[model samples]
Target: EDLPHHDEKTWNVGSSNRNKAENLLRGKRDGTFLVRESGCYACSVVVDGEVKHCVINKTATGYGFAEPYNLYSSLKELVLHYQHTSLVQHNDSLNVTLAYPVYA
Candidate 1:
């Protein structure tokens, strides 16, 4: 069977809640992140000991981070994009570039 991105990797914590995501990210360094299924696909980034969450919006065409401007065909592609690009471009307060994946 072809599993979704969340089911295919340790970084993707399938069906977990925000609290669980935050717990896993706690004490992690800035730029550490994990993808979780919390009602919808969510990405949690660690910043200064706190976890910041962002929803991965899925449209008919592709996936994006709340905005339609930058979209990708897969979740992995989307994650990879933010890993190289600063999320501050999307949300000023985030000011983070996903550098590490918090594996489960």
Candidate 2:
């Protein structure tokens, strides 16, 4: 019998978004996002009841959606996603930690 096995995941970072909030006196501004983290969609696998794993996007999984890993855009998206969506004030970070480690 064959079981499904995959690899790698990611742990997203978060922070509140900073909007047109005044910082003249360095006072806490609510309009500004805290930048706790951006709300990017992701997945994760848990093992041994610990916060450890890896993840990969199906589209970027080298399958039907086999797209080559792009550093420039990927990083850009990661950062921008955090910035724009900060106002949403939702989940701080998303996890896509996989059960297996992805190869480089």
Candidate 3:
């Protein structure tokens, strides 16, 4: 009900599972990503032709990852932040910074 970027075509692919997300990102370059409506919002990123998935959590304050420190007003803002900044800051092993968004 309180979904962010729920209708965005560029990055929000509604009600998608991991398989669907992977298919959308197939043939994409590293750093390409998409946000999908799984049980909880999830992000799929392509790194070295492998798909990596991350969860986007919603709290009383706003939308963010599992980490509590960096919350954003909306999913779009969160995506923009990660696009320019490395996800490695949040999840060190991820070694990813979103570069391209897989449009619907």
Candidate 4:
């Protein structure tokens, strides 16, 4: 019985996994959208002069999380073709996308 105490007012509304994911994303992306990839949202953080992408994992309901793949597919499009952002190509094809890094 060493669980951290959380009051009802401070608790998230969903299953435990969903709540945990939401908490993780909140601390990671400055409260950006974690449930949808409607474009124009990037969760990159820089550490010691290196840019790192935020790895967001979705919850499952008898299936599996779709964000790992689906998010990037949308991100790729947003950066590559949707006129939302720009990309840099290298070694013939690398699809290097640009995203502003954020820190909390």
Which candidate number maximizes lDDT?
A: 3
- What ranges in model 2 sit over 4 Å off? 1-72, 87-104
Poorest lDDT segment (10 consecutive residues) of candidate 4: 2-11
Clashing pairs in 1: none
> How would you encode candidate 4's per-residue C-alpha lDDT over 1-104 as one tens digit per residue?
32111121121222324334344444432212222222222233222233333323333321111333344333323322312232222112212333221111
Worst 10 residues of 3 by lDDT: 1-10
Error of 3 at 43 (Å): 0.4
Model 1 per-residue lDDT tens digits across residues 15-81: 8988898789888999888888855788899876678998878788788786655469988888777
Local accuracy by lDDT, each model: 0.78, 0.25, 0.79, 0.28
Alpha-carbon shift of residue 57 in model 2 (angstroms) = 7.1
lDDT of 3 by residue, 66-99 (tens): 6574479888888877877788866766788877
The lDDT, on a scale of 0 to 1, for candidate 3 is 0.79
Global Cα RMSD, each model: 4.7, 16.8, 5.1, 13.9
- TM-score for all predictions? 0.84, 0.18, 0.84, 0.21
Tens digit per residue, CA lDDT, model 2, 1-104: 22112111122323222221112113322221111123332322222332221232333432110135322235324333433333122222322212221110
> Compared to the true structure, candidate 4 yields what TM-score?
0.21
Which portions of model 4 show Cα errors greater than 4 Å? 1-36, 39-42, 61-104
Candidate 3 runs further than 4 Å off = 1-7
